[PDB]
Write a protein that binds this ligand. Structure first.
Ligand SMILES: [Zn+2]
Lengths: 393, 253
């Protein structure tokens, strides 16, 4: 039909979850293409799906595969229109109740009970409920330590079987990792796809082993490793050879983008968007890995596109700055006063935290600093303004 | 119980302040846990070495171990789970409060100090019942927006942001944290906001409150220190340790 018969012609992979949908989809498409040729996908996404399937060069007698990013809320509706063969669940985190958001994708997959679910085993949500569909799991199986609590600002850490607090033999970020309830021994399932080795990780790259083969990406962040893991897992499930996964991966890894780097005088600068606590903490954990001295600038606006509420910065892990090679700190943006205070409270040297009322001043200061590198963390409208001021030079 | 935060050994502290972060890994939303960071920061400035323990489900609480209890807000589900565990800490928290020791309680924590709260869907959840206030629900409405209150016992003004469906009514043996200048306050009816009973300070304010009200941060920490070491000690002035914050609080206007 308008979208139904294509589910019979195509093997349809639906990629859903809170974060990483777009990147996991783009990387999966690129690996599957190496094995199977043309892959239908929605590079930005229901009636518009009809044209994508209609542009297709392959016909009915060729191996037709679609990898589609579907929003968590739109899944029950689209699962009536088209029947996927595989669901991929990247993760679930809270918008600004998660168990209600998980219910929608449980429902959407229930509409295609034969389809396999490939879920992030490291999320305790994805083992919270009994499920009709066959499930397999990917996750991190690197070296474990003794069970320890996640950081107290972490969300979603109750055991769904006994309502005690989960601990972790390995915690990557947020509530992800090798979780274990010490009261009822509910715990992370055996992983079908294993990241077994983290071999090198920097502020701008990582190398890791997944099911006996090594991979390298050229951006930092653990969350990006999860995206590569999920895609490689889809390719293994589709039976793609290790040689073809590697070649497909290396052709498609550029979808990760690069760090937004530029120059102010002789200083090399990186600009990073911050918008919520887990995201900002992941950026701080990334830049902490830099092996050189650097200045840190943090730009906080409260405009509409930023989120009028700035209380979130108190849950971001800015305490990490005392463990970083930071030479001097700039506090900018409209709420330069509130961010300066957030940074003082970490115990960082307050004589090295300088407030600036105008972003231009931030640029002049970075321009004359002693250190060769500068990191700039910026909310959204502050990032746009900061790029626009760089244009004028 | 475990220690989540501890002052460095980069200063020489003359005092020790131990903070019990009640259910701090379950009631941990909206930035309210930044109140803990502000307590630590003010306390260090006053010469106190800060230890923060997370005292949550199934932990025993010993009133004698702690100088400040912080009890913040969380999600409806977590809040109902916290409520299930509170009888295990009732006797010790009652003794702590009766001994006039310092409590700061925000949203769900403020509510749970009292008799009960009612979810928007009508389900009543019993609280510790230590204090006499109680909290009713609203069916659909929420009180949302900026709020400004003034406490006439101290002559201090506090600012923040409210977002709550619960309507709290104080009992006759309680005072409000402040009278409402603009905002909904506890019930939208009587111009009260929060609670002040002995050394319990409760509020619906997000902010976090101590980030936006350093006057109250100083009050809580100095009260705790004088309670522990006696009213005769001489602490550094509000104006001298918090000059930068006091002026920048005004530059926002
Ligand atoms: Zn359990």
């Amino acid at each position: 039909d308008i979208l139904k018969d294509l589910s019979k012609d195509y093997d349809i992979v639906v990629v859903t979850g809170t974060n990483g949908k777009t990147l996991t989809t783009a990387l999966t498409v690129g690996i599957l293409k190496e094995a199977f040729g043309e892959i239908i996908t929605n590079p930005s996404g229901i009636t518009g799906i009809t044209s994508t399937f209609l542009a297709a060069k392959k016909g009915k007698s060729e191996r037709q595969i679609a990898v589609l990013e579907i929003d968590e809320a739109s899944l029950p509706r689209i699962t009536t229109y088209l029947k996927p063969s595989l669901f991929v669940y990247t993760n679930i985190f809270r918008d600004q109740e998660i168990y209600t958001t998980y219910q929608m994708i449980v429902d959407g997959a229930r509409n295609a009970p034969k389809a396999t679910i490939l879920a992030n085993g490291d999320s305790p949500i994805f083992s919270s409920k009994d499920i009709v569909n066959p499930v397999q799991y990917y996750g991190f199986d690197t070296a474990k330590h003794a069970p320890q609590l996640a950081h107290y600002n972490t969300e979603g850490i109750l055991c769904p079987k006994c309502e005690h607090i989960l601990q972790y033999r390995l915690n990557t970020y947020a509530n992800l990792g090798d979780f274990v309830c010490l009261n009822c021994q509910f715990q992370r399932p055996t992983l079908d796809y294993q990241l077994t080795e983290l071999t090198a990780i920097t502020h701008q790259s990582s190398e890791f082993v997944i099911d006996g083969q090594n991979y390298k990406i050229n951006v930092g962040g653990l969350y990006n490793i999860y995206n590569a893991l999920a895609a490689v897992s889809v390719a293994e499930f589709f039976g793609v050879s290790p040689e073809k996964i590697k070649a497909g991966f290396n052709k498609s890894k550029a979808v990760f983008g690069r760090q937004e780097t530029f120059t102010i005088g002789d200083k090399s600068c990186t600009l990073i968007l911050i918008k919520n606590p887990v995201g900002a903490s992941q950026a701080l954990e990334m830049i902490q890995l830099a092996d050189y001295p650097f200045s840190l600038s943090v730009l906080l606006n409260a405009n509409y596109a930023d989120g009028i509420d700035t209380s979130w910065i108190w849950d971001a892990n800015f305490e990490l700055i005392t463990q970083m090679p930071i030479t001097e700190i700039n506090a900018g943006g409209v709420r330069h006063s509130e961010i300066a205070r957030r940074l003082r409270v970490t115990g960082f040297d307050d004589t090295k935290i300088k407030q600036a009322e105008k972003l231009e001043q931030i640029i002049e200061t970075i321009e004359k600093q002693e250190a060769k590198h500068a990191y700039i963390l910026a909310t959204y409208t502050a990032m746009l303004e900061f790029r626009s001021l760089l244009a004028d030079r | 119980t475990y220690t989540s935060l501890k002052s460095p050994e980069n200063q020489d502290y003359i005092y020790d302040l131990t903070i019990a972060h009640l259910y701090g890994n379950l009631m941990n939303t909206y930035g309210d846990n930044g109140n803990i960071l502000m307590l630590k920061y003010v306390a260090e400035k006053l010469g106190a070495r800060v230890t923060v323990d997370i005292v949550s489900i199934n932990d025993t609480f010993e009133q004698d171990d702690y100088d400040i209890v912080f009890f913040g807000g969380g999600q409806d589900y977590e809040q109902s789970i916290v409520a299930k565990d509170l009888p295990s800490k009732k006797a010790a928290l009652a003794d702590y409060i009766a001994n006039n020791k310092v409590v700061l309680a925000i949203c769900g924590g403020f509510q749970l100090l009292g008799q009960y709260y009612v979810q928007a869907n009508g389900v009543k959840i019993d609280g510790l019942g230590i204090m006499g206030h109680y909290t009713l629900n609203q069916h659909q409405n929420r009180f949302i927006g900026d709020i400004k209150i003034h406490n006439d016992e101290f002559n201090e003004t506090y600012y923040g942001f409210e977002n709550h469906q619960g309507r709290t009514f104080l009992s006759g043996d309680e005072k409000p944290l402040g009278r409402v200048v603009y905002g909904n306050g506890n019930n939208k009816e009587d111009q009260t906001e929060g609670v002040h009973y002995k050394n319990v300070y409760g509020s619906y304010f997000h902010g976090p409150i101590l980030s936006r009200n350093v006057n109250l941060a100083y009050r809580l920490v100095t009260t705790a220190l004088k309670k522990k070491y006696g009213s005769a000690i001489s602490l550094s002035s509000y104006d001298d340790i918090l000059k930068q914050e006091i002026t920048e609080e005004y530059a926002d206007l």
